[PDB]
Design a protein around this nucleic acid. Structure first.
Ligand SMILES: [Mg+2]
Ligand SMILES: [Mg+2]
Ligand SMILES: [Mg+2]
Ligand SMILES: [Mg+2]
Length: 210
DNA sequence: CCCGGACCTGTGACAAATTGCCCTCAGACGG
DNA sequence: GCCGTCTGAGGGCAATTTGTCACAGGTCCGG
């Protein structure tokens, strides 16, 4: 199945994208890498890849696409827009898109890689971003260990402000996303909290392959 | 000493957003 | 050439999940 590879600069960039937008983003990165920035998406191809109907596929592409306008990317800093022209459909069931050509070197570079089947069942976009960043530290054999700082998680993934209250961080982001990964990917994930005084400062993740 | 106050935790409520579903009807094609 | 079928572009839904905040209940500080 398709092998995603991506620069670590993208794995650790600051942005806010939905699940549907990240799914499309994987195919753009795949298309670009297999080579001006103009990519293409076929409704019927998207539907088969993610086990959707043609109807529900069309709805996902259309709304994702019009929601890209105004979206930006920050590499730690420098900010860029994803698109430099609105999307448009030349043919029925087919969409044409214009990626910011200045993003090309950030896609292809110290790199991260995973098969697309590993992620196509994750629903929460924050849970996707976590699985990508763990992959960045994965070994050939399938294990790894990493400590991520809570302030850095909040900035890079752009979690909403009420998750600055730690019990909400635990309840609505950490537990759910560890649970999706353990239920929806071939990984098996555990964690422990590092504290300093009263504040929790980092989360230490350990994982292996099933 | 115990207070009021500034921290921290977890849970119950509700509001706002997203999920996979359902139905309608015109476009493109082929036989 | 007309029509039957597969597409996909629209319009909606209720059931779940995600985002937000009040309040109970712990500690330690300082005065
Ligand atoms: Mg959808
Ligand atoms: Mg009393
Ligand atoms: Mg009680
Ligand atoms: Mg009290």
């Amino acid at each position: 199945s398709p092998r995603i590879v991506q620069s670590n600069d993208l794995t650790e960039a600051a942005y806010s994208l939905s699940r549907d937008q990240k799914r499309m983003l994987y195919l753009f990165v795949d298309q670009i890498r297999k080579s001006d920035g103009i990519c293409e998406i076929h409704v019927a191809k998207y539907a088969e890849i993610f086990g959707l109907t043609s109807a529900e596929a069309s709805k996902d592409i259309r709304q994702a696409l019009k929601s890209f306008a105004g979206k930006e990317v920050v590499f730690y800093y420098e900010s860029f827009p994803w698109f430099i022209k609105p999307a448009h459909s030349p043919s029925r069931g087919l969409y044409s898109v214009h990626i910011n050509p200045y993003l090309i070197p950030f896609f292809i570079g110290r790199f991260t890689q995973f098969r697309l089947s590993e992620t196509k069942e994750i629903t929460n976009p924050y849970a996707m971003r976590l699985y990508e960043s763990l992959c960045q530290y994965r070994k050939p054999d399938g294990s790894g260990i990493v400590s991520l700082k809570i302030d850095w998680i909040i900035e890079r993934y752009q979690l909403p402000q009420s998750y600055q209250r730690m019990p909400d961080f635990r309840r609505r982001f950490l537990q759910v996303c560890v649970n999706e990964i353990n239920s929806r990917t071939p990984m098996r994930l555990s964690y422990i909290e590092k504290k300093k005084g009263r504040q929790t400062t980092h989360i230490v993740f350990s994982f292996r392959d099933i």
